[PDB]
Amino acid sequence: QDNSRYTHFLTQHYDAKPQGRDDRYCESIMRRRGLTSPCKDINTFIHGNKRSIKAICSQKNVACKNGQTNCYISKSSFQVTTCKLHGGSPWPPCQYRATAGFRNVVVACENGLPVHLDQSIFR
């Protein structure tokens, strides 16, 4: 009955309607979601309907970058925003450079729910 993994996924990779998609947006959402202590080197947010993200789990199964076999790639593209830390210091303030895009996403699923985003793809 524990769904903290799915909720942890949303908390770290989901933002239905971003208020922007620039550096200002990244520096704001990163702090709001708790990814600023220490500064997370890179993180990607997915925008759109939450039901569309869950639907990826019932699509084409593919191998994860780490070796695991429970990854799935989206059929269609999603609007995403990737925030890459500027410099290298893990100590805040954390400055971010944003890159917005429209592409397919690969997520690891568990019992039909996305639990991890295969980040390696947005580096």
Q: What residues form the annotated binding site?
A: 21-22, 65, 83, 105
Alpha-carbon distance of 51 to 35, in angstroms, equals: 24
Binding residues for substrate: 65
Binding residues for tRNA: 21-22, 83, 105
Catalytic annotation, residues? 13, 116
Alpha-carbon distance of 76 to 27, in angstroms, equals: 28
Q: Which two tokens stand for residue 81?
A: 């925003």
